[PDB]
Point group: none
Chain length 319, copies 2
Amino acid sequence: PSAYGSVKAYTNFDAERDALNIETAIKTKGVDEVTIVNILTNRSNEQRQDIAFAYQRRTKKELASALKSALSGHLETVILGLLKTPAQYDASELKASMKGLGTDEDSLIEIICSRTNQELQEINRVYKEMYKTDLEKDIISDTSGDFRKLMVALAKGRRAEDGSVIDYELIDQDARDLYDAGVKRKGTDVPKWISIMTERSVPHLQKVFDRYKSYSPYDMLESIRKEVKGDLENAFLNLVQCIQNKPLYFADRLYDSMKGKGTRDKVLIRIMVSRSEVDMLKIRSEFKRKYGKSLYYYIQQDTKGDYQKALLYLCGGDD
Amino acid sequence: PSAYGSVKAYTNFDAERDALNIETAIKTKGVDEVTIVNILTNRSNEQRQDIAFAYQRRTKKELASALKSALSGHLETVILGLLKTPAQYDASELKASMKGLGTDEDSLIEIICSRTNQELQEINRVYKEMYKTDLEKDIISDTSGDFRKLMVALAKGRRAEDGSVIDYELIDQDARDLYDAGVKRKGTDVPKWISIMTERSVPHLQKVFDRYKSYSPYDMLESIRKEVKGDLENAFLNLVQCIQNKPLYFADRLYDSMKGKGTRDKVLIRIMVSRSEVDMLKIRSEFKRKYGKSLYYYIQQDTKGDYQKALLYLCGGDD
Ligand SMILES: [Ca+2]
Ligand SMILES: [Ca+2]
Ligand SMILES: [Ca+2]
Ligand SMILES: [Ca+2]
Ligand SMILES: [Ca+2]
Ligand SMILES: [Ca+2]
Ligand SMILES: [Ca+2]
Ligand SMILES: [Ca+2]
Ligand SMILES: [Ca+2]
Ligand SMILES: [Ca+2]
Ligand SMILES: [Ca+2]
Ligand SMILES: [Ca+2]
Ligand SMILES: [Ca+2]
Ligand SMILES: [Ca+2]
């Protein structure tokens, strides 16, 4: 169990009682959204599975579809998201980003770039069972060129596992190689860049990016903005952020989702849901440090209603 | 479904008739090995299955069991081998290689590196279906290290599968990558090697190896002999030979089993049996081309008795 999540297993818990309470609030006049939120936002993801199992034993009807009926708008999205397992959620999100004409580059990049080997292995499995097809083949189908190559590599989830040993020689070499394949020469050797950033372990790459500043006038992120463009650039920039500092990566995505006019609800929700039981505490930490005010504070200003309430619960506090 | 095999189905078949003559030969005084070979080594594997059935039905005893008792030495091994189905044979040999302290690396490598996806799948099914445990597990328990990773990957039999289109860009990239991962750098990146050599299709790798010769002063085989050692080396050398020219791979194996004093009978017998209905013609072709005389010739010189005849029948002709 991750210690940096914001949402934790409810101390004293009973699935069957929750199921009853949920249904009650669902049957009530005008629906008792408040209750449904108060319960689901304060139960771990695994406890939610049990509640969905119990609710079906009582009503013979699937909790998800029931709640889908009683709810609507952004709130519905949030709840239906908190009910799926992490892999199911991520799988459905990856499927959604590729559904129809076009590709939601942003969201495809976000998931594939931040998930770990362990998380990806489970996603590939669930994605197959859920959509009777492989994530890979789906990815190869909606993307092309170098972006496709990069996304396929990351989705494999075969990055080397971090070793107890620091390979200073390899770090330097990988550093020079990154400089030689880009800033140092006209054009770019994208395959070399891809090879290294997807195969080396994160800890190792973190040091590589540091050594890299010793050979290049520009750091990795900057060098990227200069060497590539389009979806490719977007991908590398996201991936490098996830390697250097993931909690920070998400705090920035969260900031971008609310900073301006309106709200990019699709992004805000996915993060608040998927990272609630992972590193929400570090994210809030990085967010508060960088922007001056709490994440909580931004959510208050950008959202309202039960929807807001839901998000503020997943946030955890820092009011 | 193997136009290049030397042993093909006997036209006027009669599982019954054959079964009878077998029983007669077995019950004859001193045992009539001559007619037993004359029959079994001229009937297709699928046919021998029917003969085994008709025989069991008539004697209430198992043909294999009967012959094991009636025969001995090298002949017994040849016959007992021919009675098992391709999958069953490979399975047993495979198991035979790992049973007992230590591991017969050569036998294990030969089978794992030369079998195609289809053949491997059926072996995986028939293996557990025989020793009540996944082949992979047995392999993992007997193997260790880089050697293990390679054997496990090959065993899965999930190599890319063979297309229409030649991917020139990928052929070059793989070659350059193989060099960058081996001869060009201090040490070796065994994972990248395993990755490329186990996941790309054979027609593709053949070109990869040719193109590789454009980056390195030494070809793949030689590069391997310099980059790695022990079982790992042994495996790679075999694997690459199977990719470049399988019939030649086997001709070379057959030649090594007889070139010197005595005879590595196990190897000779396994190849003669396991390849008799697959590519024995190309193997004989490649053999005569490289060594001057025919395979028939070498077998003739290295073996005698009824054992000799069986091998000569499995071989084909080309006196
Ligand atoms: Ca209401
Ligand atoms: Ca609804
Ligand atoms: Ca699409
Ligand atoms: Ca788009
Ligand atoms: Ca450049
Ligand atoms: Ca650019
Ligand atoms: Ca806003
Ligand atoms: Ca005799
Ligand atoms: Ca015997
Ligand atoms: Ca053993
Ligand atoms: Ca050994
Ligand atoms: Ca080397
Ligand atoms: Ca060596
Ligand atoms: Ca000899």
